[PDB]
Amino acid sequence: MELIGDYSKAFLLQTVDGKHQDLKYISPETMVALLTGKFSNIVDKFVIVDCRYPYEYEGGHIKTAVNLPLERDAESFLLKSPIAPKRVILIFHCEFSSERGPRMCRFIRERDRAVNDYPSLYYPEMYILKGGYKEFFPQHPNFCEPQDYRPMNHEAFKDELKTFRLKTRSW
């Protein structure tokens, strides 16, 4: 397997097959391994980036996840003052096997390459959570807050979906 983004070392986590062949995917069990400190002697900090809209996040998210659905906010949070360490790892996710998580992962890599001298990176190791929140919640509800799941297409949130789409950079 290839080295991480800055070619400094191998990827730390066991991976699973996902839709995008160019990206690295992890399972809910691996996400729990990170949250439970199984990799604490090697991983200084990891950030779970929930790419879903605010109403989805508010309805139930993974504990400690940061909601950064807009490219400009993810860029500001992650790259204005980079989270330095040991390894730093980013895990991106959305509701299921959609495109919000993968798009944000690729965007952050593009910006990280842009602000660095090749091949150095602030976030050389990034993964996508396979199956997103939809598959994580039924496996580990006690690692979620609140213990619920609100889909993007929830009947009572049609206006909220629309309101938030009008804040994105492109459609």
Ligand SMILES: [Cl-]
């Ligand atoms: Cl955006």
